[PDB]
Amino acid sequence: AFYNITLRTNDGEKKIECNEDEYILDASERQNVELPYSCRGGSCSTCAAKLVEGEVDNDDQSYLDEEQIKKKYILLCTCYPKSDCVIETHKEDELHDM
Ligand code: FES
Ligand code: NA
Ligand code: NA
């Protein structure tokens, strides 16, 4: 199924949908909502975001440790939505300065 993702970016709030079988980064990009990234493989911190509400499957990621995951951080390049979500983007620095 598809879920509606509310992206709270550094340039306002944007509404985009994403198939539960695809990554949020790719879905966002085709709907013209540019998000940060670099490796696009789940092993770095560039695409870091924070889950405000909703369920996701970000098990394909590998950079974030359990402490960061518990704090709701997710890497959008490898994150599947599992319900409607409200996500804050461009959180790499926040993550870095925890
Ligand atoms: S762009 Fe590197 S983990 Fe997402
Ligand atoms: Na960019
Ligand atoms: Na450092």
UniProtKB/Swiss-Prot annotation:
[2Fe-2S] cluster binds at residues 39, 44, 47, 77. One of its GO terms (cellular component) is apicoplast. Residues 3-93 form the 2Fe-2S ferredoxin-type domain. Belongs to the 2Fe2S plant-type ferredoxin family. Its cofactor is [2Fe-2S] cluster. The gene is FD. Binds 1 2Fe-2S cluster. Signal peptide: none annotated. It comes from the Eukaryota. Keywords: 2Fe-2S, Apicoplast, Electron transport, Iron, Iron-sulfur, Metal-binding, Plastid, Transit peptide, Transport. Ferredoxins are iron-sulfur proteins that transfer electrons in a wide variety of metabolic reactions. By transferring electrons to 4-hydroxy-3-methylbut-2-enyl diphosphate reductase LytB/IspH, plays a role in the terminal step of the DOXP/MEP pathway for isoprenoid precursor biosynthesis. One of its GO terms (molecular function) is 2 iron, 2 sulfur cluster binding. This is Ferredoxin, apicoplast. GO terms for biological process: electron transport chain. The lineage of its organism: Eukaryota, Sar, Alveolata, Apicomplexa, Aconoidasida. It is found in: Plastid, Apicoplast.
